[PDB]
Design a binder for this molecule. Structure first.
Ligand SMILES: Nc1nc2c(ncn2[C@@H]2O[C@H](COP(=O)(O)O)[C@@H](O)[C@H]2O)c(=O)[nH]1
Ligand SMILES: Nc1nc2c(ncn2[C@@H]2O[C@H](COP(=O)(O)O)[C@@H](O)[C@H]2O)c(=O)[nH]1
Lengths: 828, 828
């Protein structure tokens, strides 16, 4: 939506493409609301106060100050993510292709030969995390940087099994200039970066579920988190594999040895974090060039100590040019040891040189056992060729990709992988692992058992919703659990399909109303950006991979008009009402017809009902950022605004009817889901065949009438005959809000056959309060019909006569017994 | 399938269209099995014994004796349902259209004018229940009758809102001669007729869920059943309805007053059964012609006492030609009173004649209250026009259809509908009920709360599976419940769609493996016909509205090879193996490839594995009549046949692979559903890196070999060193089943690289038994690999050499320690 707030005396409207203008000082909250229901994508907000920007930025709507026009305004056009507490703009613009470069955020790729393999004239540069080395280009009122990088192209290529690179990047560079900016995917690495370091301090613990190599680096300075994912591959499960022979396969023009050397270490550490909640010393041998070190130090600071003949530019201590051979007792315990002692064949005979590779492998294991023989908290990660070896069963294999597959895989070990566990593995049982099994993830820790906990702050962002997880176990994990941040997918389709996918995998799909939480928000992506200190410039789409977010047990459940609020509620309706092929009164006509006020749709300008909810139900696909359920519970019990209980049912009933004609079975369910939850948090009682009624007499009715005493039957009630004395409290306590309300009549109509009446206006708000006042005193009031206030005139069938809006005022009020000869109260 | 058993010396094969022949005396149930896996639809079985027919008829396969050819054989061609205990054939042939008639089983339609409204030349006749008046036409070795009637055409027409009848029947008569005979629909009224009268005595109390007007007459002689359905419409819910005026609507050329007069009584009774498990006297007034009485007496015998000026042919006592006016104390209590006191306008003025209709209505209510003022167990059903009246809230309205809508509806009352409950109803609130609300069902009793019970024998045949019922509540109703007969729909589609429908309503879809019952059958429609004394001639289709049946807590759980047995298991495979575009060994090749015996598919003629289950998994859509789960649990614990535990996993693993290539995600689930249930009822242990092994030495190996001692490693085991003394028991107890088994070798092969071996044959059955005796003695034995028995010859790579099948015999057996220098047992 991208609100751009411009200087009062310096501000221009030009022939732009998606620009509305807004300017007012009516209210801070009410102005932001009126903005947030505006249609277009780019809005100029000419005279402003900081609090109207606060509310929007809190609502996930990116709203920012603009002080100048030449570059501060033209470059903040493009889409972005805004941290509204440190005033940093994370742009997501792929217009940097124009000066003919790609850009990464990993230093190691710059030292490859890749620029030989890019298209002619292109380069890569500006290597910083989130583009934090972009900010040197711009000089604004705010800090700014373009976090768009092409990590996708390079990393997918490695996992792509394709060999021509120019063909590859030319394909993908054309995909972005064709298809939609995946803004939600890009904004997550921003979200993840600030999401954890504050969460860790606030709760003192955290568990994450399903981390992928999106987060290879997020957690390197967080030992005290415990991540769970797909389990590892074990030596225990090589016995499955059919035998196979050397397969010389090349899948990368440019050498990516530094990438696996980075991943195998990183895997080794998250393992060490899994076992002990501490973080190690990191010894190394055989790995000099190590341009992947500087990538690591941008996140967490580790002590790297290396033994290699060649240059290690990036380390604390490069101890020797000798490679660590048997001086093994000189190592500290709190450690990991990464062994990559290797060789390179020259032109020597492969059949005889193979003998050398076998002997190193025997040695490299002897180093591993002697390491793990003495001290505790020691992990290894050792180099192996594919030959017959005696390996521990419970150990974990790794084959992160490389330049080319030529028979080697790495093994990592723990202290208990030595304690009397050993198996013999044949040769071709390893090649069968090498050649077909690519390791996908450095996070090889055990799966998350789906059950509630009370010490755990559980995060689960894109791990659950998979079809293979028990639906009810995740539901109960969400309902019967405090302390979390869970994400699940919304049922964004019609005909209520419970499982939705890509023709590869299906995922479980939810509505908001699957969950009877106790104190929790259930909002969208943009809403939770606001909760955690962020705001985004692009709105969510009605279809596509939208996801419910669920915050349990948080400080922000009571702060309703701040976060996950009624912002954005009517944005799509206003499009339908005025523009997209309908009359402006379409919603004002339908809901009265569907609630049996179909004779009268004149007074549907004002005094209609079913405001917030009817929009929340039929356009949930757009505005599920508004947690409807949280809105209702906090008005059951006053913890601004107030509507009667009755109005919410009519909002539900009309959405059913609407979804029936449309045949949108998902709204139709969602309407059923709500209305019996409305009848849950509070009951509703109906004096269907009442005994008493509240009546209002007037001085003079400016109409023709044959009924001997015209009156307004203001409401009916069914009570016991000694709760009269506490009914009369209410008439007495609000006698002037009835004498003081603008009763007006302007016309006659036909309420029904043989019942010719007037219309009364301007009274309902008092009627809705009166229903609430009687309610909590446990007094029945009102019928299941819609109370349309009317003054009876005659039992005939006549013509609607219009007069000027003539004010009527109150003779008296009275509480009358139906078919009785006496009353007991009448204010005056 | 329709097995027709022909006389030995009198039996003919002619140029017929779907005829196989079968004839053998091998073994009774093995013969029926071989039959039941035959392809075609009509089978001649030339020389037979009664027990082979018993098994099939018990298996739901209709199998019958044929003694003659001219008419006993030619007319038993057509499809039918067979009661194999009373030897009655219920034919389902619509060839009676040829002599130009329709046929009903309700006497009242014959006295209408309908034959004026049939197509020219047609008639209707032969009015008996199930066609029980057909049997006078045929003189066979068995009783027989054609239960095909055209109740559909007439009854749908009444509920169709269409007015031209010739156009109607001509449409539907053409639907049957176009589309498929719905047998699963016609055989149910047979099923329902014998299903309840035996069930009521056995369980002592029966509840049925969702009865429709399929069963208007089934239950009239069963008070002690308690039916539940959609609740009634109440006076309480007229307050919803918009006001409306007289709507003169004609929807039936022929008068169907007798139909509503039948339904309103019948509704009145099932109500009385609901309140008081009882059955009443049935007084009447205003209803003389009453040709619907004889329909009632064909099911249950009631005392009907009528007051009407005109002829009542069918009753016990037509007391007077005066109509029951105020002599009301002369009635017995245990009763229902049906009031239809009415009039017929002549040419009198409708505006003045209307006054008469109003006064009767006031009177007809006075009769109703005076009735229900004195005695207990009294139920009324009274005639009303649409006018303003003072009605009880809790009463129940009825507008079963009629000739034409001209402002009348009937009301029924109970004893508590009078006890200080009354409301005023306006005129047009009734017309709005009349004109739009057609009553659907005489069964207006309250819904079934979906929860388990221990006194209840619950039937639920086609009521559950609806999308609006909580899935888990019905699941737990099936799992956590004994004493029932539940039906649910099968997931007959691919891509595992949980809810399936007609684009009108969706219904919850199941697999068999959703349910961990304790002692229950989960079979098809045809299987349960066998259980209850029936058998059907048409097989179920792979797609269409197939339904799981679930019998809990019944005497027949242990009788495996009788009911819901392995009958029919391989019918579709044999079609695929030989005919439908594949080699006969296709299944014998695939399952070895998918279980890593892919080097060898020579010995897949015999000694293959995964027999019953692999067919039960990939063709479940055809043979879900075989409850796979019941088959497995009763072989976990011996309560004929025996296979090893190991074989069932390989059956599951191969179905996964099969369903992966096909991408049939439902088998793929169903395979996962089973294999961890296999690992549930019993564990499996694997000596993956064993310590000991069982070895077998031979006199002389007729091959070339370089290993110093060729041997058969018959099996491996991982045990403690003082469970040798109870391993040797089994070494001893089966020493001759090893010496006595037909060890044979016929060729060499390559088991793997550098391992050149022979093949051993004919030993596995002993190997599978041995696995079980070590098993229940809690001894590990076998690896996760498939044990392919082999004699090692040389560590080279050579050519398969074939020899004649040469028998090898045992020098000795021995239990050896892996890499040890001693043994401790060797039989000889
Ligand atoms: N009673 C009530 N009315 C509202 C509320 N919010 C908006 N409205 C009404 O709905 C209108 C929405 O205007 P629109 O967004 O359709 O132009 C407002 O001008 C106001 O009349 C609310 O919270 N409570
Ligand atoms: N072990 C075992 N084999 C069976 C069983 N039933 C059938 N078979 C085998 O499977 C074959 C099936 O023959 P088909 O029906 O394919 O012509 C039988 O001839 C027999 O060899 C059984 O219950 N157990």
């Amino acid at each position: 939506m991208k609100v751009l707030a411009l200087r009062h005396s310096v501000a221009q409207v030009y022939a732009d493409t998606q620009i509305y203008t807004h300017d007012d000082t009516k209210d801070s909250y009410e102005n932001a609301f009126l903005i947030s229901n505006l249609t277009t994508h780019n809005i100029l907000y000419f005279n402003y106060s900081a609090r109207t920007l606060e509310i929007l930025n809190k609502s996930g709507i990116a709203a920012i100050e603009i002080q100048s026009l030449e570059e501060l305004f033209t470059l903040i056009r493009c889409n972005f993510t805004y941290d509204y507490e440190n005033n940093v703009v994370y742009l997501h613009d792929y217009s940097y292709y124009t000066n003919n470069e790609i850009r990464t955020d990993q230093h190691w790729i710059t030292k490859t030969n890749i620029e030989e393999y890019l298209l002619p004239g292109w380069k890569l540069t500006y290597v910083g995390y989130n583009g934090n080395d972009t900010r040197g280009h711009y000089n604004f009122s705010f800090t700014c940087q373009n976090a768009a990088t092409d990590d996708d192209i390079i990393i997918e290529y490695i996992y792509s099994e394709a060999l021509d690179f120019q063909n590859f990047m030319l394909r993908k560079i054309k995909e972005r200039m064709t298809t939609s900016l995946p803004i939600a995917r890009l904004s997550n690495r921003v979200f993840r970066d600030k999401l954890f370091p504050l969460l860790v301090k606030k709760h003192k613990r955290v568990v994450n579920v399903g981390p992928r190599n999106e987060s290879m680096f997020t957690f390197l300075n967080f030992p005290s988190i415990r991540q769970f994912s797909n389990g590892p591959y074990l030596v225990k499960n090589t016995i499955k594999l059919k035998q196979e022979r050397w397969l010389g396969k090349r899948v990368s023009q440019f050498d990516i040895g530094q990438y696996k050397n980075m991943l195998n270490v990183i895997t080794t550490i998250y393992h060490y974090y899994n076992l002990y909640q501490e973080k190690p010393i990191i010894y190394m041998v055989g790995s000099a060039p190590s341009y992947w070190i500087y990538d690591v130090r941008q996140y967490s600071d580790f002590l790297f100590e290396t033994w290699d003949p060649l240059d290690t530019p990036y380390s604390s201590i490069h101890h020797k040019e000798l490679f660590f051979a048997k001086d093994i007792g000189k190592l500290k315990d709190n450690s990991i040891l990464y062994i990559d002692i290797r060789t390179d064949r020259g032109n020597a005979d492969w059949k005889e040189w193979r003998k050398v590779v076998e002997l190193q492998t025997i040695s490299n294991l002897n180093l591993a056992y002697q390491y793990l023989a003495t001290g505790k908290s020691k992990v290894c990660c050792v180099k192996l060729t594919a030959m017959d070896l005696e390996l521990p069963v419970s150990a974990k294999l790794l084959h992160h990709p490389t330049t080319e597959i030529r028979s080697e895989f790495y093994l990592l070990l723990d202290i208990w992988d030595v304690n009397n566990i050993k198996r013999f593995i044949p040769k071709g049982a390893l090649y069968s692992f090498i050649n077909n099994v690519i390791t996908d993830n450095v996070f090889i820790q055990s799966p998350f058992k789906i059950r509630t906990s009370v010490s755990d702050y559980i995060v689960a962002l894109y791990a659950l919703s998979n079809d293979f997880n028990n639906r009810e176990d995740i539901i109960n994990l969400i309902n019967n659990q405090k302390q979390s941040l869970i994400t699940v997918r919304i049922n964004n389709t019609f005909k209520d399909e419970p499982k939705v996918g890509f023709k590869s995998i299906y995922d479980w799909t939810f509505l908001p109303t699957d969950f009877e939480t106790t104190n929790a928000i259930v909002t969208s992506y943009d809403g939770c950006l606001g909760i955690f200190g962020l705001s985004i410039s692009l709105a969510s789409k009605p279809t596509g991979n939208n996801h419910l977010f669920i915050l349990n047990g948080t400080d922000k459940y009571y702060k309703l008009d701040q976060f996950a609020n009624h912002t954005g509620i009517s944005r799509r309706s206003h499009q339908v009402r005025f523009s997209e092929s309908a009359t402006s009164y379409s919603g004002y006509i339908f809901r009265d017809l569907s609630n049996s006020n179909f004779n009268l749709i004149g007074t549907n300008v004002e005094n209609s009902v079913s405001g917030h909810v009817y929009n929340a139900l039929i356009y949930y696909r757009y505005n599920y950022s508004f947690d409807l359920k949280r809105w209702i519970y906090l008005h059951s019990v006053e913890k601004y605004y107030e509507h009667a209980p009755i109005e919410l049912i009519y909002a539900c009933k009309s959405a059913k009817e609407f979804a029936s004609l449309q045949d949108d079975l998902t709204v139709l369910r969602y309407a059923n889901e709500i209305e019996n939850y409305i009848n849950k948090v509070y009951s509703i009682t109906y004096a269907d065949d009442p005994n008493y009624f509240i009546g209002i007499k007037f001085n003079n009715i400016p109409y023709i009438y044959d009924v001997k005493v015209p009156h307004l039957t203001f409401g009916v009630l069914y009570i016991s005959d000694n709760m009269i004395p506490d009914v009369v409290k209410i008439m007495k306590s609000m006698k002037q809000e009835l004498f003081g309300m603008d009763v007006t009549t302007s016309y006659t109509y036909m309420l029904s056959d043989g019942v010719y009446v007037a219309n009364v206006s301007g009274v309902l708000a008092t009627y809705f309060k009166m229903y609430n006042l009687f309610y909590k005193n446990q007094i029945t009031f009102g019928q299941s019909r819609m109370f349309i206030p009317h003054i009876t005139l005659s039992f005939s069938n006549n013509k609607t006569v219009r007069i000027e809006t003539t004010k009527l005022r109150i003779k008296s009020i009275y509480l009358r017994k139906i078919r009785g000869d006496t009353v007991f109260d009448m204010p005056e």
